[PDB]
Design a protein around this ligand. Structure first.
Ligand SMILES: *[C@@H]1O[C@H](CO)[C@@H](O[C@@H]2O[C@H](CO)[C@@H](O[C@@H]3O[C@H](CO[C@H]4O[C@H](CO)[C@@H](O)[C@H](O)[C@@H]4O)[C@@H](O)[C@H](O[C@H]4O[C@H](CO)[C@@H](O)[C@H](O)[C@@H]4O[C@H]4O[C@H](CO)[C@@H](O)[C@H](O)[C@@H]4O)[C@@H]3O)[C@H](O)[C@H]2NC(C)=O)[C@H](O)[C@H]1NC(C)=O
Ligand SMILES: *[C@@H]1O[C@H](CO)[C@@H](O[C@@H]2O[C@H](CO)[C@@H](O[C@@H]3O[C@H](CO)[C@@H](O)[C@H](O)[C@@H]3O)[C@H](O)[C@H]2NC(C)=O)[C@H](O)[C@H]1NC(C)=O
Ligand SMILES: *[C@@H]1O[C@H](CO)[C@@H](O[C@@H]2O[C@H](CO)[C@@H](O[C@@H]3O[C@H](CO)[C@@H](O)[C@H](O)[C@@H]3O)[C@H](O)[C@H]2NC(C)=O)[C@H](O)[C@H]1NC(C)=O
Ligand SMILES: *[C@@H]1O[C@H](CO)[C@@H](O[C@@H]2O[C@H](CO)[C@@H](O)[C@H](O)[C@H]2NC(C)=O)[C@H](O)[C@H]1NC(C)=O
Ligand SMILES: *[C@@H]1O[C@H](CO)[C@@H](O[C@@H]2O[C@H](CO)[C@@H](O)[C@H](O)[C@H]2NC(C)=O)[C@H](O)[C@H]1NC(C)=O
Ligand SMILES: *[C@@H]1O[C@H](CO)[C@@H](O[C@@H]2O[C@H](CO)[C@@H](O)[C@H](O)[C@H]2NC(C)=O)[C@H](O)[C@H]1NC(C)=O
Ligand SMILES: *[C@@H]1O[C@H](CO)[C@@H](O[C@@H]2O[C@H](CO)[C@@H](O)[C@H](O)[C@H]2NC(C)=O)[C@H](O)[C@H]1NC(C)=O
Ligand SMILES: *[C@@H]1O[C@H](CO)[C@@H](O[C@@H]2O[C@H](CO)[C@@H](O)[C@H](O)[C@H]2NC(C)=O)[C@H](O)[C@H]1NC(C)=O
Ligand SMILES: CC(=O)N[C@@H]1[C@@H](O)[C@@H](O)[C@@H](CO)O[C@@H]1O
Ligand SMILES: *[C@@H]1O[C@H](CO)[C@@H](O)[C@H](O)[C@H]1NC(C)=O
Ligand SMILES: *[C@@H]1O[C@H](CO)[C@@H](O)[C@H](O)[C@H]1NC(C)=O
Ligand SMILES: *[C@@H]1O[C@H](CO)[C@@H](O)[C@H](O)[C@H]1NC(C)=O
Ligand SMILES: *[C@@H]1O[C@H](CO)[C@@H](O)[C@H](O)[C@H]1NC(C)=O
Ligand SMILES: *[C@@H]1O[C@H](CO)[C@@H](O)[C@H](O)[C@H]1NC(C)=O
Ligand SMILES: *[C@@H]1O[C@H](CO)[C@@H](O)[C@H](O)[C@H]1NC(C)=O
Ligand SMILES: *[C@@H]1O[C@H](CO)[C@@H](O)[C@H](O)[C@H]1NC(C)=O
Lengths: 398, 363, 313
């Protein structure tokens, strides 16, 4: 068990610290769930009595895209995927050194393809909310402003000892399970009008999504009689790598109608035109989430086609497809997996955020706004969660 | 910034520099600020441009510090400058593509004019600097045209373009359809069978060929005697040409313009015109024939030479035991009071006997 | 620089802890079944029509046994009229839709179930004739033979009536198949409810008849040997029963094993991969039985082709 002591009163000079934090999640330590196994060997139980000391008159410049704390979580989830889904073939590139003598030719074609073969057991998979807690001597601040602007200074700074519920869910084009906005859908981006930084859009209302596969692959009709030998029962008849999702159109249309109102105020009365993405990797062109080793690659072309104009006011069939050979977001290379499993898999998920890029240009005339879906950089996935916090070290005179 | 060159279709390598070695985010934008490629974690995002199915990048080099830009099927309109974006920096690069070709594919006969077609991008000043195996480093503007193109000027010519101290090499496809002679002269005597032969060099194509041989007889102004023949595949067939010369032509591409007996009126100049198509054009070649007529009129003899004779030649009539009984520079020399012997007539040209004809006198 | 991951091929198989590559065994069987089934249909059609011509006009069906022999040949014809369809079903697929599939499936089992039902009636008629000779004479009226047969056909229809509950055919697998899709909600009940009905009615019940009836008949053989023709008549009915058992009981045993691959029997997939080559052979052996009963009549039967037995020897 762990234990730390409070600070009754301290307002000294603040200095940005880069110390090593310890996780703290509510595990179980008995099930065969992987996140319960990982939290048992490296995490501690959650704080039963948290304390948030509110600072009346205190301000600070919370820069968020230069936060070194999200660089630690990104190196703590890569340590979980090497203990959760062991790939059958882990193909990764490996080059060494080839240069000539910038002034001399830079033809580097020496690269080795190292392959690793491991056992592939299909294991359970479900995220668990964790709490990152500060070590001895440091403190974690937290703004309470309902807008917070991204890298802008707030005024309602309060200090804590552990963060809120953070799930390690890995997804693209739609931020899954996590925290919601307070009062209004806000947008966050490091720099607008430079069309390189992704725009994080956080929602204030949870849009639900149900992703399941129908159990009709195996046949239940019996040809009891002349046949019953070749076409015998339990024979696969359907595609075992096909699924479908559903989105409540009457509820999702409200939340998207609030996103375009924020853009109009920000970008001075333009024609918001959403579009499908411009191509690339199948983890970028399509949606990508995980449910028990089932890596749903959901076609979202019937989700971002619609163009917009002013005066704005049921079951969208989202076609998904399970692909075995997937790209690894952690490092260059691929990872071939195992065949899918026997039974109904249901992903009764949430939608809390939205990752959007921007297509600006000067060849195109004065007014257009193209917002293609982006994401894929998993550091940007948890910058949408660790935006309120900051690790600062306060020296003690004692 | 540096500059590279394209070769109208191949790939080009445009690299950036990064000394951080952390696989940080990169981008690829033109002068019009249009995304083409970009880093997304460890993933590749083909940006919204006109180079979607063309731009490529080597992912194995991303953990080194070098980020290439591989663009296949280089067109002329793709010439633009591209800036990099790593560690908040703008590594500006430049790119230029151009091309060069001809218009006549295979019908480049011996003595046919040459035409080029340079495809240079707008906003640039190229300079044609070719290289020929005959030592012709012909330099000029952008469009180059040469009147001379023969069988000895075929081959892949190395034409390079110097611009901003950069140059790349190219090749030129030349198919030369030529003859192997400018002017043949055949020296025969009265009675001897005359043979003509003018070769070509194994070109295979569709319906292409038809031509004719014009003739100018000596002192016979009655023109319009020729022979017209058609060409289609391995095979030679006369269409129809009719007239005083019994010209028989062979059935194979080594054309044998055969003439039965060298009659004295069958001598003079001539032009052989061959015409192929798919790219029309006409070849030309000179044909000549010289006829000697040695026949005694009575107990005194007289010999004459017909044909395109030179004003420098000689003529001699000797009884082959002693020396020449007469030597003149004409075409009709006579000998009165000959003797017994095998009389020889000598046609020559500054050193060397061309024609020889034997005849006997009975006393 | 040279990565070897480029393969679009996939396998239609679930993930288990024992990979079992089960071979389809349809093509090898499709080059053996259509000529065999056609040969069965050739011999079976001309075989049974002769047994129908002879009894109707040469024998005169003057007795209850001849009536059951007629109906047994008719039951074989109902089996036979489906044989060319199954011949053209291993070879390619099911081209006949489904509206006719609720009839053809029924006609298959009407041929099957009534087939053993009249053989049992043949056994009981000969059992009554030998032991209860007073009782048999009162009840062996040809009139009573007809009404017994009519009931026997009705029961044979009802014995296939659960199979006609659902015969819907949809494209599952390579080509449309007509596999009965009985209700999913009570799925475990109906599946076990079908294995027993073939085994009890087709194997257990005639075995129980054979034990009971042929113990009373063999008692006559122990007492005296005075009448050869009584002993020779039992040889006909006895042969029909055992040739039915030689050709159908291997299927009945395997059919129990087909459903019971659980703890009751064998659980290995390789045990079910030899079993995949066992069910089709014993079903094929059962298919050949419909032409054997006229062949038995030309060898055992001393009333139909008795002069051929002397002429052959
Ligand atoms: C965002 O957050 C949401 C939470 O709101 C989360 O949804 C939850 O996802 C998990 C992960 O799939 C779900 O957990 C599964 O639930 C099913 C169904 O549980 C139901 O149980 C009863 C009976 O129906 C209901 O009353 C009840 O309400 C539940 O709905 C379980 O069956 C699953 O367990 C099986 O699968 C595991 C992994 O395959 C096995 O390890 C486990 O042993 C079970 O295996 C059995 O079935 C397999 C079927 O293939 C078979 O292969 C095995 O051999 C064995 O027979 C599993 O626990 C949970 O239900 C979801 N929550 C809700 C409310 O539905 C999202 O997933 C999350 N987003 C992301 C991206 O993670
Ligand atoms: C600055 O941040 C602090 C963070 O604590 C804010 O204090 C919190 O204010 C909310 C209301 O805005 C309080 O919620 C209310 O609490 C009462 C009593 O618990 C409850 O009955 C209400 O239903 C409601 O939930 C919250 O308790 C309070 N936090 C604490 C620790 O007391 C403060 O309001 C912020 N100031 C500004 C100007 O935004
Ligand atoms: C049982 O599994 C099958 C497939 O394994 C599922 O069928 C699929 O259903 C969707 C919609 O219900 C079909 O999409 C539609 O296809 C038609 C024809 O191409 C098109 O015109 C429509 O616009 C729509 O896209 C899909 O094609 C179909 N798949 C097949 C192979 O037929 C079925 O949904 C599963 N059962 C249950 C209860 O879910
Ligand atoms: C929200 O953030 C934006 C930029 O991220 C801030 O805009 C800048 O504000 C400073 C002073 O605060 C000015 O000097 C700059 O000229 C502003 N730049 C632009 C592009 O507007 C904005 O002030 C922030 N809002 C709050 C309330 O802090
Ligand atoms: C966001 O990016 C833009 C570029 O798209 C930056 O604007 C440049 O600012 C510098 C100095 O202020 C000027 O010299 C450039 O001419 C500007 N470029 C353009 C296109 O306007 C802007 O400063 C960036 N903002 C932040 C906060 O980083
Ligand atoms: C997801 O959407 C599909 C498409 O409507 C739903 O499928 C229908 O389900 C109803 C049952 O409520 C059936 O009566 C329809 O026939 C189905 N349609 C088709 C085309 O098959 C599906 O039920 C939805 N799933 C959820 C969980 O809402
Ligand atoms: C996705 O699934 C959830 C839960 O299975 C559905 O949520 C329920 O929806 C019904 C009516 O559809 C409501 O009466 C319940 O109160 C809901 N429960 C919860 C916990 O939300 C949801 O409707 C499904 N979405 C779609 C589009 O089918
Ligand atoms: C997904 O969205 C649903 C929307 O109803 C969430 O359900 C509510 O969540 C709040 C927050 O904890 C609870 O106080 C409510 O009691 C929940 N409602 C019901 C009917 O249970 C749900 O929690 C969201 N999922 C996650 C993982 O946050
Ligand atoms: C999914 C699939 O088809 N897997 C195969 C894999 O077995 C291996 O042969 C690979 C070659 O490196 O090609 C692929
Ligand atoms: C904080 O600011 C408020 C202004 O409303 C003031 O009343 C209060 O005294 C300040 N707090 C301290 C500790 O000075
Ligand atoms: C290539 O990779 C293999 C496997 O990791 C290794 O054994 C070998 O030494 C490597 N070769 C080079 C040149 O790096
Ligand atoms: C842009 O929108 C603002 C909203 O406050 C409005 O005041 C302004 O007039 C609009 N400008 C144009 C050109 O429509
Ligand atoms: C998007 O919708 C429009 C109609 O609103 C349609 O014309 C267009 O084809 C759709 N986009 C795609 C990619 O099909
Ligand atoms: C916005 O709405 C007004 C009326 O509500 C309309 O006149 C105007 O044209 C609309 N704007 C655009 C860009 O269509
Ligand atoms: C969705 O929003 C658009 C915005 O103009 C509106 O026209 C449409 O009617 C909305 N659909 C539903 C089902 O509310
Ligand atoms: C865009 O703005 C420029 C400068 O204000 C103007 O010259 C041009 O006409 C505008 N474009 C259109 C389509 O009106």
């Amino acid at each position: 068990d762990n234990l730390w002591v409070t600070v009754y009163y301290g307002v000294p000079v603040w200095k940005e610290a880069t110390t090593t934090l310890f996780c703290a999640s509510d595990a179980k330590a008995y099930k065969a769930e992987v996140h319960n196994v990982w939290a048992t060997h490296a995490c501690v139980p959650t704080d039963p009595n948290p304390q948030e000391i509110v600072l009346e008159n205190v301000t600070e410049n919370f820069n968020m895209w230069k936060n070194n704390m999200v660089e630690q979580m990104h190196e703590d989830i890569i340590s979980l995927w090497d203990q959760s889904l062991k790939p059958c073939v882990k193909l990764t590139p490996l080059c060494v050194t080839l240069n000539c003598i910038d002034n001399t030719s830079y033809r580097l074609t020496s690269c080795n393809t190292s392959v690793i073969t491991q056992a592939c057991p299909k294991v359970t998979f479900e995220p668990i909310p964790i709490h990152y807690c500060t070590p001895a001597g440091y403190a974690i601040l937290k703004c309470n402003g309902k807008k917070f602007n991204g890298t802008g200074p707030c005024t309602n700074v309060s200090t804590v000892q552990c963060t809120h519920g953070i799930k390690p869910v890995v997804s693209t084009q739609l931020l899954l399970n996590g925290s919601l906005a307070e009062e209004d859908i806000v947008i966050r981006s490091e720099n607008l009008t430079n069309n390189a930084k992704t725009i994080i859009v956080q929602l204030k209302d949870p849009v639900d999504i149900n992703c399941t596969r129908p159990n009709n692959n195996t046949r239940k009709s019996i040809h009891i009689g002349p046949g019953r030998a070749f076409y015998a029962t339990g024979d696969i008849i359907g595609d075992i790598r096909q699924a479908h999702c559903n989105l409540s159109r009457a509820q999702w249309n409200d939340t998207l109608s609030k996103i375009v109102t924020k853009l109009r105020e920000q970008f001075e009365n333009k024609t918001i035109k959403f579009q499908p993405p411009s191509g690339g990797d199948p983890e970028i062109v399509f949606h990508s989430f995980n449910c028990g080793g089932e890596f749903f690659y959901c076609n979202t072309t019937q989700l971002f086609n619609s163009t917009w104009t002013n005066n704005t006011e049921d079951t969208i069939t989202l076609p998904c497809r399970i692909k075995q050979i997937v790209n690894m977001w952690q490092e260059v290379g691929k990872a071939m997996y195992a065949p899918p499993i026997k039974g109904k898999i249901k992903c009764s998920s949430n939608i809390t955020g939205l990752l959007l890029t921007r297509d600006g240009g000067n060849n195109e005339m004065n007014t257009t706004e193209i917002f293609r879906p982006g994401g894929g950089d998993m550091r940007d996935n948890w910058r949408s969660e660790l935006y309120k916090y900051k690790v600062v070290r306060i020296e003690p005179l004692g | 910034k540096k500059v590279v060159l394209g070769k109208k279709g191949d790939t080009v390598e445009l690299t950036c520099t990064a000394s951080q070695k952390k696989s940080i985010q990169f981008h690829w934008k033109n002068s019009n600020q249009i995304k083409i490629l970009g880093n997304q974690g460890s993933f590749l995002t083909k940006g919204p441009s006109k180079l979607n199915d063309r731009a490529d990048s080597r992912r194995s080099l991303w953990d080194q510090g070098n980020f290439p830009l591989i663009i296949k099927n280089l067109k002329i309109e793709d010439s633009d400058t591209y800036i990099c974006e790593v560690e908040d920096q703008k590594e500006e690069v430049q790119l230029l593509v151009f091309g060069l070709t001809a218009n006549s594919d295979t019908h480049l006969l011996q003595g046919q004019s040459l035409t080029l077609t340079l495809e240079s991008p707008p906003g640039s000043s190229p300079s044609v600097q070719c290289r020929s195996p005959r030592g012709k480093n012909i330099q000029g503007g952008k469009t180059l045209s040469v009147s001379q193109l023969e069988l000895q000027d075929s081959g892949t010519w190395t034409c390079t373009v110097l611009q901003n101290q950069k140059k790349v090499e190219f090749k030129i496809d030349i198919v030369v359809l030529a003859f192997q002679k400018a002017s043949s002269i055949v020296y025969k005597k009265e009675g001897e069978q005359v043979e003509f032969s003018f070769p070509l060099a194994f070109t295979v194509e569709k319906l292409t060929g038809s031509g004719e041989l014009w003739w100018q007889a000596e002192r016979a102004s009655s023109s319009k005697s020729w022979i017209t023949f058609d060409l289609k595949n391995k095979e030679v067939s006369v269409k129809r040409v009719t007239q005083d010369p019994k010209l028989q032509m062979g059935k194979k591409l080594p054309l044998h313009l055969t003439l039965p007996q060298a009659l004295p009126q069958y001598a003079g100049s001539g032009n052989l015109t061959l015409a192929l198509e798919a790219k029309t054009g006409k070849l030309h070649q000179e044909v000549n024939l010289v006829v000697m007529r040695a026949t005694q009129l009575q107990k005194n003899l007289t010999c004459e030479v017909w044909g395109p004779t030179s004003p420098k030649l000689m003529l001699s009539l000797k009884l082959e035991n002693k020396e020449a009984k007469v030597s003149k520079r004409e075409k009709a020399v006579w000998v009165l009071n000959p003797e017994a012997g095998m009389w020889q007539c000598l046609l020559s040209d500054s050193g060397q006997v061309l024609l020889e004809s034997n005849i006997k006198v009975l006393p | 620089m040279d990565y070897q991951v480029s393969s679009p091929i996939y396998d239609i198989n679930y993930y288990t802890s024992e990979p079992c590559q089960k071979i389809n065994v349809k093509q090898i069987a499709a080059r053996l079944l259509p000529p065999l089934y056609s040969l069965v249909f050739i011999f079976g059609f001309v075989g049974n029509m002769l047994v129908i011509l002879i009894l109707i006009n040469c024998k005169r069906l003057k007795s209850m046994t001849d009536i059951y022999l007629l109906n047994l040949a008719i039951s074989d014809l109902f089996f036979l009229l489906t044989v060319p369809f199954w011949a053209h079903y291993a070879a390619a697929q099911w081209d006949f839709g489904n509206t006719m599939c609720q009839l053809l499936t029924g006609l298959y089992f009407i041929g099957f179930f009534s087939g053993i039902f009249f053989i049992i009636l043949l056994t009981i008629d000969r059992y009554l004739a030998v032991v209860h000779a007073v009782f048999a004479l009162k009840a062996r009226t040809v009139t009573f033979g007809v009404v017994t047969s009519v009931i026997t056909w009705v029961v044979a229809v009802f014995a296939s009536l659960p199979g006609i509950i659902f015969t819907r055919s949809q494209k599952e697998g390579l080509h449309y198949t007509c596999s009965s899709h009985f209700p999913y909600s009570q799925y475990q009940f109906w599946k076990n409810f079908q294995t027993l009905k073939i085994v009890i009615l087709g194997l257990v019940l005639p075995l129980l008849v054979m034990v009971i009836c042929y113990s009373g008949i063999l008692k006559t053989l122990l007492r005296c040997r005075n009448e050869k023709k009584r002993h020779r008549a039992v040889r006909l009915i006895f042969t029909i029963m055992i040739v039915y058992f030689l050709f159908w009981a291997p299927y009945n045993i395997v059919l129990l094993l087909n459903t019971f691959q659980e703890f009751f029997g064998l659980n290995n997939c390789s045990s079910s991969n030899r079993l995949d080559q066992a069910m089709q052979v014993t079903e094929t052996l059962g298919m050949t039985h419909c032409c054997i009963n006229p062949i038995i009549y030309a060898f055992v039967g001393e009333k139909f082709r008795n002069y051929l037995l002397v002429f052959f020897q």
